[PDB]
């Protein structure tokens, strides 16, 4: 009995019996704060506690997984640091924004341009999320981190016509770009669902900041950092902020981001997309 | 030969029999795998998660479908308004269908286990004011006023300094399992009513709104169990997928 | 309380409907006699929906190959089966060098015979599934027309499946071949949301614009049950 | 006698099934083996061998076949001119058909491991220069000048005391295996680009020939593992065979 | 990274194509109800192309014997098969003495059970199967007419195989037949380069002169992809 | 279970499943300088390194593999020695030779006419080639051994005709044959793949000369000398060589041949062809 | 029951195979051999004559 | 393997293989003078000795069979 199987690769074991010299072929079985990072910093005196993403830090990929003979780069100091985005302002109609990462920061400082020199890209994330207000506003922000976020189309809205969205919103770049339909997601699936993956909620009573730690998630240790984005960013107003007459009406929402454990491959020519 | 004897259910096919058929690619050695966030052996794990309830369902807001996740609450000129009611079992049609409970749960008959419903308070942050919310056994019907809801289990919350409140909905059945409730001769199987009421009033300072919306929150515990695979009535083909 | 049969390795396994193939004799599609079908899973429905649950999978996959006339009935009619692995010469015609079964893998069986079973292990490139592929498998610039290749992920093509009547004249039976899958020694990762709309292409989650169904039923009034 | 139980899958003939027929010579005795040399019991010792790559293909060369196996070389005006480009995969259609390491490869279609390719200068003795030899990760096209192709992987090489260089295409990939890469959708698995360009000049004494030829070999390394067995393009009938 | 999948075991070893036989009712060739086939499998190019990767070759076969009417249906017709070592008496007829199977090995199917499986061993004299002879097998000199024998290893025609329908009376139902060959136990030496030219006569490597195939793909410029 | 397999005369061991007591019935199962020899010598002081084919030294018939009952003669002095051939002048559009061992030495010396009155023939042999140039010559030649080297034919090139070559094609005897179609080299097979063979490359810049030790290869330990062809030798001009006007353009190629370790058996009357 | 697979090659016969079948005469006692001269167990022994 | 077979109740031993759970579904196998009575008497000098039936003289129902 050759150990050719899927399921010889974890740490679960399994009873089975198996007439062949293959183990696929054989049959199922019983079943048994401040956050200082490089030359930026932080400090959240509002924010909730930092929640991790599926209960993992980012780390360097290890000898096991890498199928990689090259020896990457690791620019500490010049990759890995807080990147502040431009802020979106609220109104009561608005619909919510999402980001596709890593799509921001590809035009930004040296973790762009080593991108673009780089064919293969690993590194985890570091989400932030800001938004002020008084005790005089109420209202509810949901910032959740789905990965794999595909973006689907109404097909014209009767559904006989196949259109696929364009680069632009496929790749907001770092403005970023806006919900059509919320409820869906534009990816047909409930909102009410979204905090199944890792999740936090803004609420202007309490806490007005958010904290997100994901690390790198792929069936591959090293990808193309242009083509393949990871996960998306939705910033979503579930319950809309009211205001009586005479406050202030500017609510902006900043969004900050930092990568971390960068490692780079396959230094190559100048590639822009 | 070794002398062998048929029985009936020959040359049949189970599509839940686990068998042992012929490798296509003899010693095949596939790709060796790597170490991925977020393995879920489980379909329980999901079932744990908080995720929004839909309270308020109405057939004005289907139109608005983003004003289902909320509903309203402010300022009473009476004593004990009904603000919302809504069925506790996860497996029937109504609010529980928003939730990821509701839908795992639809795959499977008998359920069992108690369940938990979690508020969040959305209102300014000098609002004030208290709730009364209640969980009536089975029997009861919409208590017509809080003197007759009370008389189940219930629990008291403030707005000022507390952003949630978990009613935990206790295991009350005679029966190990419970399958799902429908229409008609199947409301044997029906788990109680939620009931939210108006204990105080909505206090609200100069200057700040008067209207607040609360979300509603649902998952499972530690003790809650399913069984028995089916399907749902959530996909349905009327056309060929091209 | 046994949670033995909420886990996924019960509630992955069992067979499914994925293909549905026919060779009618009357017909401008596969009457030629046999027929070329690329290989996807996503164009049945109800099974689409479980996988979905999850982004990266992997597992094994079992194989019930049920073969029957429109009617229902059944002739003496001997069938040939073939897996195509990329890169492997595609049948022509029914006499055709490819089916000659060199190093391609075949199954033969006949249509009074139990259905046919095959064991197929994992054979994708990378660690597992990747049902959601965010991003462009080719390089450069994409406009309007090369949109086509989002949401498009080059692990997940792993051959083409083709059926044939032997013998060189033209059989006179239809048939109608109908696949299924079991997928057993599973492993799962990255849970999803499920999808409350109707589907409408394989390749992407489109949804119609015009009606977005509720995911819950609706009443009159919020007090009232 | 003992009961039985049948199970789908019964009467069929699996191509690739190992299984257990009876003899038709019971007990019969073969003819003693005797040692004959050149035992290969594994394909990947037949593809570490250096075999003729052809750099250059030409249509007009395909009246002239021997014209394939090499390329010429000679003295330039300017300054970086590109001698030869072609691909690093070995199972595309193109140079790397000739060479035996292509040629097995097309049996197989999950493709691993380095490779490398050798260049041998059959010049004149007394003919001396330089080349760099570059390898390009994917991603980029064809380098315009040789300022662009140096950003990656390249290698120094002189004609005079020295007859050959290996220039080793190191794996760099975002899988473990390598499909075959086809035209349009299945670019994504392309290796990369191998160029060669010109470092200083052809220089040459006067009484010996101004122009060279180049023949280039590649082959495997250790590390090159091959999958996943199928069938190729390279054999084809059109006609019974008489 | 294991190497079992390119060793010569698992690529050496499957089903393979090596014969086709027909018996048609009405014809010049087979109509007498019997057919009397040399035993050559290199009239098959596919497999052909695999063996000659090498020279010297020792392994044994197993076979499938696959029967059906050539429009594909089925009939319930009794098949005799027999094998006809080298001196052995070679049937005349249907009828025949040599069918008779008194110390000749021999298989019997019907059409409506599953394939025949036979296992044979390895039968030639030498110590492995010679592909390629350089020489001749007879003595003296050799004409223009008398060339025939070059490239004729003696040691390859270990035998012949026959077919017939058993009984008297004409069987009124064509039948085709199908040889396969699995190889097992195999051992391998001298390998050859791989020919890239098209396949003419069985007995002979010979090439069409007038167009040379080369082995690659032709370009505009060499300079570019 | 007897012992009748086809893998029993190996050293791997494989582990198999048998229902039956022939062991071939059975499946598949998991899978696991100066030389100076006899009166002549030579000295090559511009010559690569030796090339053992496939890395075995030519010697005697074990008794194991033997199944003459005869005592065969051996003699060391009179066979086996340097025999120097006919020197082939190399042209621009020489498409190269080929030789037929062992039927070059068949008309030569002792060795030619003991292999006449011996029925069976077992030796190894010695390969070298000798092409001279100067400093001023550019060109490349590629000396490789094929076993069992079949001469095909272009069938009058429409292929509908069957036609076999000559005895003087087959057997060019000590003169040697030119090829017609290199790229093929009339076996219908690509010379680019003909270096998985043992070969060895002359550069005239470098080395004017090649050696390569071949030992017996055959499915059988003696076999006629006369009929039977081992292997052949080819020379291909693979880089034609250039010079400029002015230069000798006479440049030869000399193959010169040893037999090791010969064997003969069967002593019998005069046999030429 | 045990579950079973059939492989092709059933339904046929092999007149060589060398198998097992049912006896027509249960503990059927045959009658007690006695000692013949020229016993030949091997072809080889007429050959060598 | 219960015991309800009808071989079962003598002495005689026999080996047999079965596939179910009842014996008798299982397959056959190895197969392995003055005589003074009472109130009245008889003398018999020119009789021939007494013949006994089967072997066996008569005696009284054991409790054992009685039922
Ligand atoms: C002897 C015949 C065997 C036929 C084998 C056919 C292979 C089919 C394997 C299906 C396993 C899943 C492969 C991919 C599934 C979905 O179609 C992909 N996600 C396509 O996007
Ligand atoms: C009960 C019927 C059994 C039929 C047995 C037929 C024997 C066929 C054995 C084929 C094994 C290879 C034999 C030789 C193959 C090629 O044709 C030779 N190289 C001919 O040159």
């Known amino acids: 009995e050759n150990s050719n199987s899927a399921s010889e690769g974890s740490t679960i074991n399994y009873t089975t019996i198996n007439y ?7 049959s199922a079985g019983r079943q048994d704060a401040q956050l200082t990072i490089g030359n930026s910093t932080i400090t959240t005196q509002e924010a909730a506690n930092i929640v ?7 780390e360097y990929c290890p ?22 985005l431009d802020t979106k302002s609220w109104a009561k109609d608005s619909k919510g924004w999402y980001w596709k990462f890593p799509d921001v920061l590809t035009e930004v400082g040296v973790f762009g341009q080593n991108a673009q020199f780089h064919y293969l890209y690993r590194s985890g994330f570091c989400v932030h999320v800001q938004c002020n207000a008084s005790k005089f506003h109420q209202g509810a922000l949901l910032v959740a981190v789905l990965p794999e976020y595909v973006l689907g189309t109404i097909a014209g809205g009767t559904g006989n016509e196949n259109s696929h969205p364009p680069y632009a919103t496929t790749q907001p770049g770092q403005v970023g770009a806006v919900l059509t339909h919320p409820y869906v997601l534009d990816a047909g699936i409930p909102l009410s669902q979204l905090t199944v993956c890792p999740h936090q909620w803004i609420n202007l009573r309490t806490n007005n900041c958010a904290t997100i730690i994901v690390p790198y998630m792929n069936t591959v240790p090293f990808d193309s950092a242009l083509n393949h984005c990871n996960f998306g960013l939705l910033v979503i107003p579930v319950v809309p902020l009211d205001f009586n007459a005479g406050a202030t009406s500017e609510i902006p929402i900043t969004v900050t981001i930092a990568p971390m454990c960068a490692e780079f491959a396959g230094l190559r020519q100048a590639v822009k997309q | 030969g070794i002398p062998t004897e048929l029985k009936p259910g020959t040359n049949q096919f189970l599509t839940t029999d686990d068998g042992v058929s012929a490798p296509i690619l003899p010693g095949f050695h596939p790709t060796p795998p790597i170490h991925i966030p977020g393995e879920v052996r489980n379909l329980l794990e999901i079932c744990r998660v908080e995720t929004i309830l839909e309270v308020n369902n109405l057939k004005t807001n289907e139109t608005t479908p983003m004003q289902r996740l909320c509903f309203p609450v402010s300022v009473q000129s009476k004593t004990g308004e009904l603000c919302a009611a809504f069925r506790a079992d996860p497996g029937r049609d109504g609010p529980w269908q928003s939730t990821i409970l509701g839908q795992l749960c639809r795959y499977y008959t008998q359920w069992s286990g108690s369940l938990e419903v979690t508020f969040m308070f959305a209102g300014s942050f000098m609002a004030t004011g208290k709730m009364l919310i209640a969980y009536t056994p089975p029997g009861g019907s919409v208590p017509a006023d809080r003197i007759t809801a009370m008389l189940g289990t219930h629990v008291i919350w403030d707005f000022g300094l507390q952003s949630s409140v978990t009613l935990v909905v206790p295991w009350i059945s005679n029966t190990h399992y419970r399958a799902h409730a429908r229409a008609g001769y199947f409301d044997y199987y029906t788990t109680g009513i939620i009931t939210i009421w108006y204990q105080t009033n909505y206090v609200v300072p100069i200057g700040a709104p008067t209207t607040a919306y609360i979300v509603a929150l649902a998952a499972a515990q530690d003790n809650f169990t399913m069984k028995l695979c089916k399907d749902t009535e959530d996909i349905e083909q009327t056309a060929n997928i091209q | 309380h046994s949670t033995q ?15 549905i193939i026919t060779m009618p004799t009357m017909g401008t599609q596969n009457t030629d006699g046999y027929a070329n079908w690329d290989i996807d899973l996503m164009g049945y429905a109800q099974l689409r929906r479980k996988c979905e649950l999850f982004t990266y999978m992997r597992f094994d996959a079992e194989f019930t190959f049920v073969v029957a006339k429109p009617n229902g009935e059944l002739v003496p009619q001997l069938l040939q089966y073939m897996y195509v692995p990329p890169g492997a010469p595609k049948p022509t015609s029914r006499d055709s060098f490819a089916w000659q079964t060199a190093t391609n893998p075949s199954v033969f069986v006949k249509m009074t015979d139990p259905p046919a079973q095959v064991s197929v292990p994992f054979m994708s490139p990378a660690s597992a599934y990747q049902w959601f592929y965010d991003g462009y498998p080719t390089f450069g610039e ?13 692990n997940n093509m792993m051959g083409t499946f083709s059926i044939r009547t032997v013998g060189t004249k033209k059989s006179p039976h239809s048939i109608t071949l109908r696949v299924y899958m079991r997928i057993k020694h599973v492993r799962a990762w990255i849970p999803r949301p499920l999808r409350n709309q109707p589907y409408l292409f394989k390749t992407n989650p489109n949804y119609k614009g015009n009606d977005i169904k509720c995911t819950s039923t609706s009443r009159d009034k919020i007090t009232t049950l």
């Open chain 3, 142 to 154: 994409h406009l309007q027309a090369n949109d086509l290749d989002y949401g498009q992920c080059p």
């Open chain 1, 20 to 26: 062949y010299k293959d183990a696929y072929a054989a």
């Open chain 3, 5 to 19: 049969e909420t886990a996924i390795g019960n509630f992955f396994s069992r067979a499914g409907l994925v293909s």
């Open chain 1, 52 to 58: 991790i993403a599926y209960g993992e830090w980012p």
């Open chain 1, 63 to 84: 000898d096991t997984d890498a199928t990689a003979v090259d020896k990457p780069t690791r620019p500490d100091v010049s990759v890995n640091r807080f990147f502040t």
